[PDB]
């Protein structure tokens, strides 16, 4: 009578919680669609909470729609206002506003992101575009340098010289082992409201790629081989353009199409353009910094105790432990133990004795990985026989 | 888990038909099994051909999944009450021929979470039963049972159609990718049908006019 | 264009009349959404000469969340989409008690239009 | 030469992952670590003099714990955890003795133990003695470290 | 602890009037109650659980759980008094609360209470100073608390389709 | 730190279904509770150098008491009823050690506890001892309480 | 070994033709069988011929090559998460008849560098299969499996060709 | 129980037509068996039928 119990219908979504994997999770930093804080990062989980926090209809919301249906698991959203428009105005008051020092208020404590991505700056293609993109590069190679674990996903102009002269720019080794371009953008499938499609930016596409990659095989396996679920073609090939060739800048990946397989990621190689330093190969440096993540999770467990020779070896046999698994589960090279890893905290092997006054514990690390097969060079003998 | 920690007991839900229309009797067994085991098998026969080209062996008939479990009843504990005779005469009625049609009882074996063969529900009738009483009374009321059940697949024919339209409904619908051919488009949209689409038939259906004319992103309909 | 033309054309559930337009008409993909909206808000008897055709939902009304409910729950909705409503798979039907105002069960049905994770060994001890 | 080492002192560190912190626990009998590699002897038809031993299969064997009965730890709160089925969490444990000083002579580090059995001391009228508490874990691989193997 | 509702009526035509000519009841101004109805595929059914308090949260609605929880009142206090003229020493507080926990984790493993760990289905506390004081304990008092945790009907289903593209 | 629990101090409250008053019995010799998991072994294809140990179910031990043959309490007269098979009854057992003042340190509250044994001490000519009947009981469940768990 | 130290599964592709055109489902299972097994057969037949003069028997038919092979799933230790009806899921449906046909899958079972009979990949369909439930939980998702699978040879038509015309190419 | 506890031992009654008209000896036999033992059992075929749409026995 007052109450009727029944079967009823809606379309509330129920959400689920915690996907971790820091290290891989994106970060959104486009302009707020046009009831969201203007500066805190919000968690976005399915496709479902994309929609109905940022509408459908954007570039931020594209972006959002085009990260889930690549696969991605989470992703997290840093809005930034309800931007002015006349767009030349608003990707200048975009790097503007990323040159704060409220950005690294942010980005330091914020702990729960891996993969800072401004998709926005594909607009400046419409859009000097140069300085434009010199500084729109800088200003995130910056931000991931400052912090503890974050890498960058940067993206090329289409047209060739003016994507030639930004790889030919200066960037320090610092900042270049941590950051990645991948050149073609993307012509996707959704409408723009009419029979033309919608060009978006590779780098959501991209992003749902590393952190599948990583939560199907591993994070250290690559980023590339993976075909590109929503996308018609890239808007330029290679085969047409071939400066970006020119051996003289940074290192850029390729973003393909094939005849008996879709469109595929076709590179992982950082802006290091350095032949013997192993910080490029993007799963490297995600690997890598993984294993930062973790080994600083239980040493801040070992903190507050005595700098005795007890706690030292009580943390060498919990890193130990650790480091036998993961080269058991296939992450690092060697077929011995004694070539895979190695660790040597102590007195005199790390430490000194002014070093444990002033309260420090020092532990080294040695580590040996994985390479890429990214060439296959192929023989044939004959071996004549009679 | 996740909400609380009461058991899931098995319920054996039985019928008269083939389809769920006339419900039997349908009885909640205690004292879970500890083990299932269900166990496939298909026969083949080899092909003793003379030509001597080739070793391969024919598909005669799938023999149906049959379900093995093991039961056990007591009342003399001071939880248990009723009677265990009243608990048997429910598996002794539908493991056995229904007095009004003559035949067995089309049963259903179902437990909380366990999914069976591919589905909620394991479907079939009674191959096999044996009761075994061990413990008795002054005046013989049993009181331990100690059943050994025995199944068969056997489900009914509108479960096995709809299962049968969900793969290959004689449609395709095939997308094509950037960089496509009709060859291989004709190979995507064989292995949808698994039918050998014959490509000549995909320019025919679709109105193309001249083998390429497909655009990265359109939809080509494959029937048959 | 070609999903109006494989995906049957029919009318909308909630029966809308005009003189302008005759009658709306839920055709493609949005009719799959209709027809299984159809079927959890329909129960078995209520159709006459079909009385198969139906969700059966009120079988769970005073049923306590006990999550012997919630596999009975997943169980009903996955045959019944078997049975009658082929034109679309399953994908998974993820049910939560709501947790602002609970006793009410929230159903969410995802459809299809018809690897182990070695990641985490690097996240565990 | 150096002096051997006795069996009097000893450390072990626990870490689970339901808990937040390492804890360290003092025990009094520790039992003593096994690893046997498994082989098999096989009779060849022409040789009667040799015998031909094949290696198979790693075995470790268990870790067996001793304490009195005191307040509850953080171990003997999550044996009962495990023991009652809430969890199958297990640890890495760390087990190190010590010289005069205070240094880690031998460190034998165990991985993944998983808590399998508590044993209780008998209650006697006439006993004069401490209740005593019988613990074991099965852990999954075994690694030595230290400068005295 | 289960519902009153959901049954079928046995020898009963049919009820005298339906909600569907009478739409007075509905005003949600008072006590909450219980609607007897008829369906097409099935008899006269009882179509509701839910007590006279017509409050949101204060979960002494809802009949089941107010004859369970005096269900727990009925035989918890067959053990208090079985343990009654004792002594009030620390003792006889534990011989009370060894039997209270052994039947209350009983209960929650038979599917009574919620919670799938014990930590959050109930709990006892018996003490010096954990409910008592040392003024009760003189005047012959041995008090005892329960915490219980209790399961929610699923009185309403809100069904969502979601589509999922896939190409 | 704290003092251990020694184990010379014990009450046991027995409570049965038969008998309407929750009885106090003084014993000798409680015997000792024990709970194993019972873990089986797994071997793998390619690995050779580790374990794998997979938990299946729970094994609780027995409870064995001994007393002195003394006045008929309401227990042996209960083992009497059970072992001429004339009730099926069991109860709930609470046992627990006492502090130096009275204070209860370690609890461990078995359910269900059913009497499956007697067992009669010797009759010698040359004895010097008391008559001692051993008792033992199967239990279904068991929860250590207390802050000395 | 001679790079690394990871373990190489097992993984059981399917198919629905004969040979390799159109694949189905592929899954690959975690904890190795621990021990294979082979099993080859020829049936022979003794003449029994009237003139006594030699004693011999008559080649028949080759039975086909079967693979016995036994796995394990659990789901409760906790570095398994995914449930094992998800990864039973697919054995059981690869070793049963589909529905799109109305035959078996032809599956193929490869090892990282165990070679098969005289090949690094085992063709065939499944004869056999058991699964075996051993423990459970409160609400029973079962969480421990002891699958015993078996399969028979079953090469396709253009491989068996080709390893016909390696021996004596009628030059 | 509930009146008193005597054994009831089993009995074998025979007769000699399908009914109970004519009865032939019965005896009953001391020492109950322990354990008695009744098995079912019914016999499917399965259908080979050409058509391949359904599984059935």
């Given at each position: 009578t007052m109450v009727l119990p029944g079967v009823s219908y809606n379309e509330t979504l129920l959400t689920q919680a915690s996907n971790d994997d820091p290290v891989t999770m994106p970060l959104f930093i486009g302009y707020t669609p046009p009831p969201v804080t203007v500066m805190q990062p919000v968690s976005v989980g399915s496709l479902t909470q994309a929609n109905s926090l940022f509408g459908q209809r954007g570039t931020l919301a594209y972006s959002l729609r085009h990260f889930f249906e690549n696969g991605g698991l989470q992703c997290y959203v840093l809005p930034l206002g309800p931007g002015k428009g006349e767009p030349a105005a608003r990707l200048q008051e975009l790097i503007a506003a990323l040159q704060t020092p409220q950005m690294l208020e942010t980005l330091l404590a914020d702990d729960k992101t891996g993969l800072v991505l401004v998709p926005e700056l594909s607009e400046l293609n419409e859009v000097d575009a140069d300085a434009l993109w010199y500084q729109g590069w800088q200003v995130l190679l910056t931000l991931c340098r400052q912090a503890p674990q974050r890498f960058a996903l940067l993206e090329l102009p289409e047209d060739p010289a003016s994507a030639v002269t930004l790889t030919q720019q200066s960037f320090s080794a610092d900042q270049c082992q941590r950051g990645a371009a991948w050149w073609p953008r993307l012509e996707t499938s959704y409408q723009d409201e009419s029979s033309a499609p919608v060009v978006l930016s590779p780098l959501p596409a991209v992003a749902a790629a590393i952190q599948r990659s990583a939560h199907d095989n591993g994070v250290w396996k690559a980023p590339a081989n993976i075909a590109l679920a929503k996308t018609r073609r890239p808007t330029q090939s290679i085969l047409t353009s071939?400066?970006?060739?020119?051996?003289?800048?940074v290192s850029c990946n390729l973003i393909r199409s094939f005849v008996g397989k879709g469109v595929r990621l076709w590179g992982c190689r950082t802006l290091l353009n350095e032949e013997n330093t192993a910080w490029r190969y993007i799963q490297i440096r995600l690997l890598v910094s993984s294993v930062e993540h973790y080994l600083s999770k239980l040493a801040r467990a070992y903190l507050f105790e005595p700098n005795t020779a007890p706690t030292w070896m009580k943390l060498k046999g919990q890193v130990w432990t650790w480091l036998r698994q993961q080269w058991l589960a296939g992450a690092f090279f060697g077929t011995v133990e004694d070539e895979a890893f190695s660790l040597s905290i102590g007195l005199d092997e790390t430490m000194t004795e002014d070093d444990i006054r002033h309260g420090k514990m020092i532990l080294q690390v040695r580590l040996a990985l994985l390479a890429p097969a990214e060439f296959i060079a192929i023989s044939l003998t004959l071996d004549l026989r009679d | 888990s996740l909400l609380e920690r009461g058991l899931s007991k098995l319920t054996l839900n039985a019928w008269k038909?083939?389809?769920?229309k006339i419900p039997a009797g349908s009885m909640s067994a205690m004292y879970n099994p500890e083990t299932i085991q269900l166990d496939y098998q298909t026969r083949f026969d080899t092909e003793d051909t003379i030509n001597t080209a080739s070793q391969s062996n024919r598909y005669v008939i799938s023999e149906p999944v049959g379900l093995n479990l093991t039961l056990l009843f007591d009342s003399q504990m001071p939880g248990n009450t009723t009677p265990i005779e009243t608990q048997l005469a429910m598996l002794k009625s539908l493991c056995a021929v229904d007095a009004a049609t003559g035949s067995p009882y089309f049963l259903r074996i179902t437990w909380g979470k366990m999914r069976w063969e591919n589905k909620g529900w394991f479907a079939g009738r009674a191959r096999d039963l044996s009761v075994t009483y061990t413990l008795f009374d002054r005046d013989a009321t049993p009181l331990r049972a100690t059943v050994q059940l025995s199944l068969v697949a056997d489900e009914s024919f509108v479960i096995q159609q709809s299962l049968k339209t969900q793969?290959?409904?004689?449609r395709a619908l095939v997308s094509v990718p950037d960089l496509a051919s009709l060859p291989l488009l004709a190979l995507s949209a064989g292995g949808v049908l698994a039918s050998s689409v014959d490509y000549l038939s995909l320019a025919w259906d679709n109105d193309l006019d001249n083998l390429d004319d497909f655009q990265t992103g359109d939809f080509l309909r494959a029937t048959k | 264009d070609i999903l109006k033309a494989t995906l049957g054309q029919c009318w909308a559930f909630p029966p809308r009349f005009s003189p302008d337009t005759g009658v709306s008409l839920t055709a493609g993909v949005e009719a799959v959404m209709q027809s299984l909206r159809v079927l959890f808000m329909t129960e078995p008897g209520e159709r006459i000469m079909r009385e198969s055709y139906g969700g059966g939902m009120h079988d769970f009304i005073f049923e306590n969340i006990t999550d012997e409910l919630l596999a009975n729950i997943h169980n009903r909705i996955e045959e019944s989409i078997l049975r009658h409503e082929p034109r679309a798979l399953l994908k998974d039907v993820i049910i939560q008690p709501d947790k602002q105002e609970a006793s009410r069960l929230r159903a969410q049905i995802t459809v299809y239009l018809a690897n182990i994770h070695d990641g985490q060994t690097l996240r565990l001890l | 030469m150096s002096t051997p080492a006795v069996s009097h002192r000893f450390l072990v560190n626990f870490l689970f992952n339901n808990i937040p912190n390492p804890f360290d626990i003092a025990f009094q009998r520790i039992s003593g670590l096994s690893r046997t590699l498994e082989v098999s002897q096989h009779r060849e038809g022409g040789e009667n003099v040799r015998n031909l031993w094949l290696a198979e299969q790693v075995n470790h064997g268990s870790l067996v714990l001793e304490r009195g009965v005191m307040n509850a730890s953080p171990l003997t709160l999550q044996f009962d955890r495990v023991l009652r089925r809430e969890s199958t969490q297990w640890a890495n444990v760390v087990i190190m003795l010590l010289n005069e000083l205070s240094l880690p002579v031998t460190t034998w580090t165990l991985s993944h133990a998983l808590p399998v059995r508590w044993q209780m001391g008998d209650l006697d009228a006439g006993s004069n003695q401490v209740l005593i508490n019988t613990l074991e874990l099965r852990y999954q691989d075994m690694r030595m470290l230290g400068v005295k193997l």
């Amino acid at each position: 009578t007052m109450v009727l119990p029944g079967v009823s219908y809606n379309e509330t979504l129920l959400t689920q919680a915690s996907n971790d994997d820091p290290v891989t999770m994106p970060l959104f930093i486009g302009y707020t669609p046009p009831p969201v804080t203007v500066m805190q990062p919000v968690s976005v989980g399915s496709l479902t909470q994309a929609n109905s926090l940022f509408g459908q209809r954007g570039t931020l919301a594209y972006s959002l729609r085009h990260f889930f249906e690549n696969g991605g698991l989470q992703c997290y959203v840093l809005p930034l206002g309800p931007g002015k428009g006349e767009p030349a105005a608003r990707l200048q008051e975009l790097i503007a506003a990323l040159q704060t020092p409220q950005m690294l208020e942010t980005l330091l404590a914020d702990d729960k992101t891996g993969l800072v991505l401004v998709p926005e700056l594909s607009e400046l293609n419409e859009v000097d575009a140069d300085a434009l993109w010199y500084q729109g590069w800088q200003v995130l190679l910056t931000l991931c340098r400052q912090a503890p674990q974050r890498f960058a996903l940067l993206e090329l102009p289409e047209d060739p010289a003016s994507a030639v002269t930004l790889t030919q720019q200066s960037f320090s080794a610092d900042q270049c082992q941590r950051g990645a371009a991948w050149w073609p953008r993307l012509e996707t499938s959704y409408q723009d409201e009419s029979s033309a499609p919608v060009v978006l930016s590779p780098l959501p596409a991209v992003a749902a790629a590393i952190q599948r990659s990583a939560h199907d095989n591993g994070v250290w396996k690559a980023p590339a081989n993976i075909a590109l679920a929503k996308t018609r073609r890239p808007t330029q090939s290679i085969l047409t353009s071939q400066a970006l060739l020119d051996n003289q800048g940074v290192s850029c990946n390729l973003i393909r199409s094939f005849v008996g397989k879709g469109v595929r990621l076709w590179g992982c190689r950082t802006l290091l353009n350095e032949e013997n330093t192993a910080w490029r190969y993007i799963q490297i440096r995600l690997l890598v910094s993984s294993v930062e993540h973790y080994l600083s999770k239980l040493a801040r467990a070992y903190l507050f105790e005595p700098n005795t020779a007890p706690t030292w070896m009580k943390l060498k046999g919990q890193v130990w432990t650790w480091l036998r698994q993961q080269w058991l589960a296939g992450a690092f090279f060697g077929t011995v133990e004694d070539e895979a890893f190695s660790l040597s905290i102590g007195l005199d092997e790390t430490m000194t004795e002014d070093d444990i006054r002033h309260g420090k514990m020092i532990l080294q690390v040695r580590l040996a990985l994985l390479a890429p097969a990214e060439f296959i060079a192929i023989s044939l003998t004959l071996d004549l026989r009679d | 888990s996740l909400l609380e920690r009461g058991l899931s007991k098995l319920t054996l839900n039985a019928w008269k038909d083939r389809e769920g229309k006339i419900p039997a009797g349908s009885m909640s067994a205690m004292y879970n099994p500890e083990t299932i085991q269900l166990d496939y098998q298909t026969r083949f026969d080899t092909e003793d051909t003379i030509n001597t080209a080739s070793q391969s062996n024919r598909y005669v008939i799938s023999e149906p999944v049959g379900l093995n479990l093991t039961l056990l009843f007591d009342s003399q504990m001071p939880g248990n009450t009723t009677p265990i005779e009243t608990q048997l005469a429910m598996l002794k009625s539908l493991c056995a021929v229904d007095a009004a049609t003559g035949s067995p009882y089309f049963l259903r074996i179902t437990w909380g979470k366990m999914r069976w063969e591919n589905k909620g529900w394991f479907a079939g009738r009674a191959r096999d039963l044996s009761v075994t009483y061990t413990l008795f009374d002054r005046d013989a009321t049993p009181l331990r049972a100690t059943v050994q059940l025995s199944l068969v697949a056997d489900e009914s024919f509108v479960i096995q159609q709809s299962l049968k339209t969900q793969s290959a409904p004689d449609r395709a619908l095939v997308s094509v990718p950037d960089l496509a051919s009709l060859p291989l488009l004709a190979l995507s949209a064989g292995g949808v049908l698994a039918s050998s689409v014959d490509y000549l038939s995909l320019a025919w259906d679709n109105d193309l006019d001249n083998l390429d004319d497909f655009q990265t992103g359109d939809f080509l309909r494959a029937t048959k | 264009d070609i999903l109006k033309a494989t995906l049957g054309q029919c009318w909308a559930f909630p029966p809308r009349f005009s003189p302008d337009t005759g009658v709306s008409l839920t055709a493609g993909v949005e009719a799959v959404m209709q027809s299984l909206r159809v079927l959890f808000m329909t129960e078995p008897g209520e159709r006459i000469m079909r009385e198969s055709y139906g969700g059966g939902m009120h079988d769970f009304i005073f049923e306590n969340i006990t999550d012997e409910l919630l596999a009975n729950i997943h169980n009903r909705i996955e045959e019944s989409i078997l049975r009658h409503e082929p034109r679309a798979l399953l994908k998974d039907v993820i049910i939560q008690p709501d947790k602002q105002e609970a006793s009410r069960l929230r159903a969410q049905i995802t459809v299809y239009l018809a690897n182990i994770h070695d990641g985490q060994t690097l996240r565990l001890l | 030469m150096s002096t051997p080492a006795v069996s009097h002192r000893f450390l072990v560190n626990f870490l689970f992952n339901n808990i937040p912190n390492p804890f360290d626990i003092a025990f009094q009998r520790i039992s003593g670590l096994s690893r046997t590699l498994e082989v098999s002897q096989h009779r060849e038809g022409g040789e009667n003099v040799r015998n031909l031993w094949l290696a198979e299969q790693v075995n470790h064997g268990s870790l067996v714990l001793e304490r009195g009965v005191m307040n509850a730890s953080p171990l003997t709160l999550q044996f009962d955890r495990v023991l009652r089925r809430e969890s199958t969490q297990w640890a890495n444990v760390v087990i190190m003795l010590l010289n005069e000083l205070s240094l880690p002579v031998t460190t034998w580090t165990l991985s993944h133990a998983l808590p399998v059995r508590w044993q209780m001391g008998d209650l006697d009228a006439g006993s004069n003695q401490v209740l005593i508490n019988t613990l074991e874990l099965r852990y999954q691989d075994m690694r030595m470290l230290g400068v005295k193997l």
